[PDB]
A paper describes a structure:
In MPD-ub, which has been extensively characterized before, one set of well-resolved 1H–15N cross-peaks is observed. In cubic-PEG-ub many residues give rise to two peaks, as exemplified in Fig. 1d. In rod-PEG-ub we find—for several instances of well-isolated regions of the spectrum—three peaks per residue. This peak multiplicity is in good agreement with the number of non-equivalent molecules in the asymmetric unit of the crystals, i.e. one (MPD-ub), two (cubic-PEG-ub) and three (rod-PEG-ub), respectively. In particular, the ‘base' level of R1ρ within secondary structure regions is significantly higher in cubic-PEG-ub (12 s−1) than in MPD-ub (3.5 s−1). The overall offset in the ‘base' R1ρ rates of the two crystals points to a global motion that involves the entire molecule. This motion appears to be present in cubic-PEG-ub crystals, but absent or less pronounced in MPD-ub crystals. Clearly, the rocking motion found in the MD simulation of cubic-PEG-ub (order parameters 0.982 and 0.957 for chains A and B, respectively) is much more pronounced than for MPD-ub and rod-PEG-ub (average order parameter 0.995 for both systems). Generally, we can safely conclude that rocking motion in cubic-PEG-ub occurs on the timescale from hundreds of nanoseconds to tens of microseconds. The Wilson B-factor in cubic-PEG-ub is almost fourfold higher than in MPD-ub and the resolution is significantly lower, which we propose to arise from differences in the respective rocking dynamics. As expected, cubic-PEG-ub shows the highest librational as well as translational amplitude among the three crystal structures, in good qualitative agreement with our NMR and MD data. In our case, the packing density is indeed lowest for the crystal with the most pronounced rocking motion, with solvent content Vs of 58% for cubic-PEG-ub, 49% for MPD-ub and 40% for rod-PEG-ub, respectively.
Here we report on the combined use of MAS NMR, XRD and microsecond-long molecular dynamics (MD) simulations of explicit crystal lattices to characterize the overall rocking motion and the local internal dynamics of the protein [name] in three different crystal forms. We prepared three different crystal forms of the 8-kDa globular protein [name]. These crystals are henceforth referred to as MPD-ub, cubic-PEG-ub and rod-PEG-ub, reflecting the different precipitation agents (methyl-pentanediol (MPD) and polyethylene glycol (PEG), respectively) and the morphology of the crystals. We have shown here that three independent and complementary techniques, NMR, MD and XRD, all provide evidence for an overall rocking motion in protein crystals.
Numbering used by the authors: 1 to 74
The structure:
Amino acid sequence: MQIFVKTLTGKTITLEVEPSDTIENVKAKIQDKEGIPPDQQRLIFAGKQLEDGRTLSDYNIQKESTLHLVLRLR
Ligand SMILES: [Zn+2]
Ligand SMILES: [Zn+2]
Ligand SMILES: [Zn+2]
């Protein structure tokens, strides 16, 4: 399946994922794509921020769903 990751930048990134992909996996895919390291990413879906451990299915994220990426730079 496919999901979108819209940036605060504005640009939209599209990812090939699986329903049982962990958020950690999603962060990994974004690093393989945009260079940004996992522990610098925060992911938002329908106003809630996602946990590295739990999966897309758990958050009921199906195809063509949009996730927000916000950077934590510390
Ligand atoms: Zn996967
Ligand atoms: Zn890789
Ligand atoms: Zn949105």
